[PDB]
Amino acid sequence: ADVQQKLAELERQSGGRLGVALINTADNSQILYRADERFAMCSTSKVMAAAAVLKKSESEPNLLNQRVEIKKSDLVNYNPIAEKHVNGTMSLAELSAAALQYSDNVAMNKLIAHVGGPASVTAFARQLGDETFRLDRTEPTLNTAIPGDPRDTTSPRAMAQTLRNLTLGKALGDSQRAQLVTWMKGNTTGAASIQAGLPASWVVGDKTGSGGYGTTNDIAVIWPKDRAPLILVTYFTQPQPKAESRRDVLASAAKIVTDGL
Template sequence: MKKFWVNKWLAGFVITMLSGCGMNQDDLAVDQLKEPSHIETEGTLDQQFKQLEKDFDARLGVYALETGTGMTIRYRDDERFAYASTFKALAVGAVLVQSPTEELDKRITYTSNDLISHSPITKEHVENGMTIRELCDAAVRYSDNTAANLLLKELGGPEGFAKVLKQIGDDVTNPVRMELELNEATPGDIRDTSTPKALANSLQAFTLGEVLPADKRFILTNWMKENTTGDELIRAGAPTGWVVGDKTGAGSFGTRNDIAVVWPPDRAPIVIAILSSRDTKDAKANDALIAKAAKIVLDSLGKTM
């Protein structure tokens, strides 16, 4: 059974302490991260997620962590889903791990033969190439597929990407192929899959943890906040005034995903991964499924903060 995990006592204690200290959002970053709580309570979240699955004829996976209190919301959080383009945020994190800041201005050249579908930025720069920094921006903010492949090559291919993930503790996410093949999302095929929990934990490591220095965390989170593809997904389910930095993904079998860091006003950030799939290859994905799941999660966490 999927569970809603919450430590009410800890939540109240942390809120009281933070209110008394008058801490700002910058204070509620790396040093405020907590271990997920493990006190189980019964609630209606399971039923709400099941109803969404029924309404959208889809399978849904959710993992959310409120980093200040350690509260988590989980639904199919250890089940595998094709990660699709959500990997681009993690791949860019891996590139930032491996590249000194000055190397981000290294120019990568490529030809028209390297271009694949949905490459809105790289297709405009074939003549002069793009810097690693520009490729990272294109991959995260525009989900540019050629940019993602060029960055994977910088990492040593999917194998090199997997190596960095393992170094930060993620031995679940399974990079094997590049764009566009990784979007096949065939049920039962574990290539290019992960779980909501693993993706959220890796995203947390790159954006809020100590895997990257503060300046690189700032760069990555800003790219995610300025993402152009996510307005109808987790952002659409967030309360007014909450800042969302996300990376979306889509593939065959109705795959529609979004992973994000969400900053409520004057509170510690929330890390969230919402993944979904359907049973038939040509099934249409639905952004509203992700948005409604996000609303359930963020409303629930908002009430306990």
């Protein structure tokens, strides 16, 4: 209850909409705040796309080594890795890492294309038992995050449950699950988000997202020191189209729901 109140307080101060789902695998409990509302996933959707490629690889040896051409026409709005490879190839492993660890958008588009498009990523989510996730478009338009628009959204509850399946459960084979977690633990974009609300000794694998309407997201698998793992989704979005990102709100939310663990 105290946690409920404190999240409400943080929401009020922030001026936006906050969605939180914590799963504590110590005792199979959850902390939920607007966990059944929809939020634009933005780049947090890249976990699902990388996982779909990993799943495909279980029946296609060496798929992760398959090369993909990067052409000027592939560049989009945010290309931190791909812009270094124009007019060469990158492997699907390389693209997965770039999508997950740098939030590269070309890399996401290549993962999307490889598996058959947004509807294929969505069908993979369904196959896992996630009936909430929907990836409707490609990069960069999937990040518009317009209030009231259900495209490219999920709920905090659904994303937490799916991320626990992917990272701690059996959605993926052991090699593929380890590769996903390795990639996420190597993320470079999350240090100001959930990470920033946890003790320094805790280990985190996370994926951030940023979008229109100051949308600021993070989904994480967390290994606290000497404790069973956690799954945490913190989604946040704002009323103004050009609102500035608020990674600090995610850090605050993470502190509130884990303080006292």
